[PDB]
Write a structure and sequence with these properties.
Chains A, C: Keywords: Acetylation, Cytoplasm, Dioxygenase, Iron, Metal-binding, Nucleus, Oxidoreductase, Transcription, Transcription regulation. Chains A, C: Its EC number is 1.14.11.30, 1.14.11.n4. The complex is a heterotetramer, with two copies of chain A and two copies of chain B. Chain A is an alpha+beta fold. In chain A, 23% of the residues lie in helices and 23% in strands. Chain A has two domains: 1-300, Jelly Rolls, CATH 2.60.120; 301-344, Helix Hairpins (Orthogonal Bundle), CATH 1.10.287.1010. The longest helix of chain A has 19 residues, at 307-325. The two termini of chain A are 36 Å apart. Chain B is mostly helical. Chain B starts with a helix and ends in a 10-residue tail after the last helix. The longest helix of chain B has 5 residues, at 2-6. Classes of the chains: A alpha+beta, B mainly alpha. The structure holds N-oxalylglycine (2 copies) and zinc ion (ZN) (2 copies). One zinc ion (ZN) is lined by residues 194, 196, 274 of chain C.
């Protein structure tokens, strides 16, 4: 009987009989099924095939950020330098991303998280203050690595496996590395489902993160915000309380998931939705991603179109209409007028 | 043109 | 109490005490209100103002087609030449226009009228055959005037008031005259509501036609077919039996109407919807229209946009998506995906 | 471009 959906599978055993890395109670509970993302060696031809076909895979032995595996708050505070770091703060576990430039278009959007620039030692101290007073405030540091980092971090950065990732960039025809985002979160933090328009090698350093991915063909089930809204590219669906009246096809969504730990690298293909959560009671998490611009669009389109190309078309229709109407608020009414009693 | 509509941006969850 | 809608008004009296030109029983009955289109002299500055503002007006004294006022079936059969004339045939009074080039896109569209090419004497004879046998078949001749017409028709054509209409073309910045369509219909024939993308001076020659116009801002109430459908630019609504479940905003439509007779010229502005019916029991009708390409689009758009510019935008979105998806049938599903739970 | 989307065709109820 057809009535597969293993999810992250049986938790892995840490070497030296150090016990399970995590347990099922540290995962949040959601309404949809999932199947596992494959975990493979970087020397496995299957892994090359998945990356080539823009499908996710966890690579267990790239050594991509090997020198960063010794990173923790004390080491970073000593060596990360005196630059500013963007720290998001929220009274909820969900850190929904928003584009500050688009907030003028939507005056009624009130962010639930707020950004504060601070030095790294201030970040560590605010964490301490929270932890000792039993506070419910949550922090998520998210900052691109820049030229202000200290000498030891430079040394560690130079020690990444550029041989391997530069070869991937070349083999896939991708554009330049645009940035490395340092992500330091508290246990239980969640980045809600969204897609990015760049290719991502997501390199886990400390702690464990559950990553739930959805292919671009589930656009219909995930209901992104309007393109001019500050939450462009993020799902409108509250995974903790899905509104099935507004979002009926969320009842059909099916994810791919994995739990990445220190040394793992997750390939998140461009336009793939991803929901990322730091495991409950797992301590702080540290990740560095590697964002690459996608390979150029082919000069002559080949049919059938891929799912992500249809997403690109819809985004461009929304952008063009916003510019032509002179106001993004008129996009919706025009689109509805175009469809009602004509295409629906 | 048909080629333009398929073109992608480079937007990511990162402040400029 | 605000609870104006005169319609065509009290029928006009024919000169020489020849009685009313028509009576209310010769008009079909419809569900919506209407107000009158103004009837003015071409020397009235109000008429110039209406044409300039792309609003309809009936001009009563242009002499635009003065030499054609003696036209009837016998005169035309003698002098119109031996060319082919497109004659549409239908078992209904409604002659819904369709684009034969688009029929490959929609295999399930079965036209209710059929086109037959014939000589003018064959057209007259088929009319006779119908009239004598009490048949229910209906014919509508619709043919652009071309270089095959006989010498007397050339003389009559040369006698049109080109001084007047060439001045209008110049004053409005319109493009070239593209064609003169000769329209010869049977009493009771109806051309269902549609808009044209050219400017039209509609010159009535024989019989009376009731013209019901709707401004471009009633797009929302009139539900045009998809752009790739053969009935592009025609309303989907059956005015004789409006489906208010599919077309709810047809309950809000409001028209402008008039009855034109011999010597009248109706300005039908580009993108204005028009429904045209030859009066019941009024005999055959003869019209010649004058179609002009619109004035060029301004280089820099000025806001707010006019209603017809929003129509132009929607048409271009539908066209572009058809080309980009490689198949017009995919337009609807993509548009719905773009709107559902996002803009509606 | 914004100018292109406002551009009009010249389609009329007449066979080509
Ligand atoms: O790690 C997180 O919490 C969120 N990360 C991303 O969305 C990403 O790397 O693209
Ligand atoms: O006269 C008719 O029956 C139909 N005419 C038109 O749609 C027109 O002239 O644009
Ligand atoms: Zn992301
Ligand atoms: Zn017309």
């Amino acid at each position: 009987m057809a009535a597969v959906a293993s999810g992250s599978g049986e938790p892995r055993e840490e070497a030296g009989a150090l016990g399970p890395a995590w347990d099922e109670s540290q995962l949040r509970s959601y309404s949809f099924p999932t199947r596992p993302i494959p975990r493979l060696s970087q020397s496995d031809p299957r892994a090359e095939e998945l990356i080539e076909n823009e499908e996710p895979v966890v690579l267990t032995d790239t050594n991509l950020v090997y020198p960063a595996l010794k990173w923790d708050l004390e080491y970073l505070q000593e060596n990360i330098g005196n630059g500013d770091f963007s720290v998001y703060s929220a009274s909820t576990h969900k850190f929904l991303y928003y584009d500050e430039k688009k907030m003028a278009n939507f005056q009624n959007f009130k962010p639930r998280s707020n950004r504060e620039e601070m030095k790294f030692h201030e970040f560590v101290e605010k964490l301490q203050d929270i932890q000792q007073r039993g506070g419910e405030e949550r922090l998520y540091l998210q900052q691109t690595l820049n030229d202000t980092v200290g000498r030891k971090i430079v040394m560690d950065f130079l020690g990444f496996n550029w041989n391997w990732i530069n070869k991937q960039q070349g083999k896939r025809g991708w554009g330049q590395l645009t940035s490395n985002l340092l992500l330091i979160g508290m246990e239980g933090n969640v980045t809600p489902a969204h897609y990015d328009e760049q290719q991502n090698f997501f390199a886990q350093i400390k702690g464990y993160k559950r990553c739930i991915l959805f292919p671009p063909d589930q656009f219909e089930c995930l209901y992104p915000y309007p393109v001019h809204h500050p939450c462009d590219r993020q799902s409108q669906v509250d995974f903790d309380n899905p509104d099935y009246e507004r979002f009926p096809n969320f009842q059909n969504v099916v994810g791919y998931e994995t739990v990445v730990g220190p040394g793992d690298v997750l390939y998140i293909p461009m336009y793939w939705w991803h929901h990322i959560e730091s495991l409950l009671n797992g301590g702080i998490t540290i990740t560095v991603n590697f964002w690459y611009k996608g390979a150029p669009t082919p000069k002559r389109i080949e049919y059938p179109l891929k799912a992500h190309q249809k997403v690109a078309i819809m985004r461009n229709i929304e952008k063009m209409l916003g510019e032509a109407l002179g106001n993004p608020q008129e996009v919706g009414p025009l689109l509805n007028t175009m469809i009602k009693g004509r295409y629906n | 043109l048909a080629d333009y509509l398929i073109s992608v941006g480079a937007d990511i969850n990162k402040i400029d």
